[PDB]
Amino acid sequence: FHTVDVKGVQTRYFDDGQDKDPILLIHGGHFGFFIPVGIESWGNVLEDFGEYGRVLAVDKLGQGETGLPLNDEDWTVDAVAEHVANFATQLGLKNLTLVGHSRGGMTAVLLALKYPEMVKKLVIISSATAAPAPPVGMDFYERVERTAPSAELIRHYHAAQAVNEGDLPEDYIGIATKWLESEKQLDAVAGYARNAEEHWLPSLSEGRRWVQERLADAGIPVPTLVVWGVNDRSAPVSMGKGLFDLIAANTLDSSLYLINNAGHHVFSDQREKFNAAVGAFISL
Amino acid sequence: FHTVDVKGVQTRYFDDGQDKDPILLIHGGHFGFFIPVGIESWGNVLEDFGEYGRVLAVDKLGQGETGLPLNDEDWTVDAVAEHVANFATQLGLKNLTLVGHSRGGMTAVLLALKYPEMVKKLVIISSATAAPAPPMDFYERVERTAPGGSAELIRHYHAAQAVNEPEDYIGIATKWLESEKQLDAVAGYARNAEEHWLPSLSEGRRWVQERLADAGIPVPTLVVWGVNDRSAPVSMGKGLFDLIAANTLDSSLYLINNAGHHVFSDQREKFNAAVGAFISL
């Protein structure tokens, strides 16, 4: 991988680096989250999407191997999105296809809404931040954290959310274990404990309100695909269908793809289907 | 463009014809429907799918230029599906990708459930027949609010259906609308609907649902729907996909926004991209 200084934040990323239009992958999780998330969490997609463009993937602010925010005020969704935007600008990325999984999706949306000039296409995978609440379901992550005996924790989480499950390669287990036991993770947990109530959570609620407000106005200004696994255990499909209902309201160029026998990690559960559909979408 | 006899029935079909695995397109509507439907209604699809395989298409029983059912007891859904099946047997199609639209979808589904050995995979487009029952009738309303005719009827119908914007189809449908076969078909429907065809719909639906709740569809399935379908609401599509997903692991749903009942016409590029992707798996 590579490292670049983004506004004083040391930032790790992956680059193809083919002579094609860029595809930017934005992973899930958040700074201080009990499961460490990074570029390697994309597993095979890093390689596979090489068929459809110049793949890049960045560790988000305070995750993977990129440094934590330099300000308490930067423990916000806007600061994460801004970090990704500044990152893309530093590399001179132009005809960008944004691909966002889970919270990354949120990040992705926020970019597509705020910087249309930079974005050509938007792909949203299992992002429930702006999604309408289910009728009744939603304590998945608390349960997963509770039922864990740490490599064991990572293995356990993966097994917990998988539907067409496979076992994680030992290399990824090693990398993520290193993340989980790193000083930066400890600092990230302390930082979340310090800045959650004052900065992160309110920015989350306001982010949801503003996104939904935009979807009910002019909608997303770029072509948008929503991908969801039918058997998602942490982000129920109902939320995906509701989200897409919110999106189709004023975004004419939008689509919804639901894959059966797939969990929160759709790309991991139904690799071939995912690659085919999303690749076809990116390719037009 | 081609003609062949099927069980004593003059049947017209289209062939690509390439050295590729077959793709059988099944159009919608039914015999005696006030709007005549045929192969031409597939428009660009007929050519566009030449990339994903050997495209074949066929006018269903008592539609297009194919003949009417031989007896009145053959005005059933099963008769239509069996007609297409015997057509396939006579042509000997193996590794077959079935693509059905509207009522055609229903046909395809039956073919997928009765003859899995023949079918490689299934695509269902805007077929509400096997869908869960929803909570004035659209087509009756369209016919009621139409002017004469008959070009104005076809244009009124397509206007009533279109959301986001084939010449061959318009011309030929105008010609069919004033043909004798269409008259005979309307009379035949008027005669055999209440006794045969509608019960055939009820039973067909019941058996298909019951089959989905058992072992599900035996082949990989894609459901395609237009969000702004006037004739068959998206809720029916999502319901049908629920029923399918219950026991069909390899199943998928694709919802295209800014698209109505004729999805392939309203959003050609997206449709071709997704369905083509599915077929190339």
Author numbering:
A (entry chain A): 24 to 160, 163 to 174, 177 to 311
B (entry chain B): 24 to 158, 163 to 192, 196 to 311
Text of the article:
MehpH is a monoalkyl phthalate hydrolases discovered from Gordonia sp. Strain P8219, a Gram-positive bacteria, and able to dissimilate several different kinds of monoester, such as MBP, MEP and MEHP18. Here we report the structures of MehpH, a monoalkyl phthalate (MBP) hydrolase that catalyzes the reaction of MBP to phthalic acid and the corresponding alcohol, in apo and ligand-bound form. The structure of MehpH, determined at a resolution of 2.3 Å, exhibits the typical fold of the α/β hydrolase superfamily and is composed of an α/β hydrolase core (residues 24-152 and 225-311) and an α-helical lid domain (residues 153-224). The tunnel is narrow in the body of the structure, but significantly enlarged at the substrate entrance, due to the flexibility of the NC-loop. The catalytic triad, composed of Ser125, Asp259 and His291 with His291 bridging Asp259 and Ser125 through hydrogen bonds, is situated at the bottle-neck of the tunnel, suggesting this tunnel may be involved in the hydrolysis process of MehpH.
